[PDB]
Amino acid sequence: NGFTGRKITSQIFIGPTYYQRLKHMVDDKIHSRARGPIQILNRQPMEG
């Protein structure tokens, strides 16, 4: 255990595995709104 240095009772399965970083980053997805722009036809919040 990294926090206490005690051995973990279960022996953990560990080794090299090929991982991929995918295009989907949270910083390109996070979004918030509070009284922003509105659509012309119906005066409702925009899309996107």
Add this chain to the structure above:
DNA sequence: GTATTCGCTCTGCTCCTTCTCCCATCCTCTCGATATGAGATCAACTAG
């Protein structure tokens, strides 16, 4: 004078045809397409 039909109508019954409707939610991104003045009328001035 009643059989007996019998023509004609009145639904009504299946069926085929038409037609109209519907087909999860939410989110991100990219990419392509999408005239000008003259004359007349009228109304406000803008003064005489």
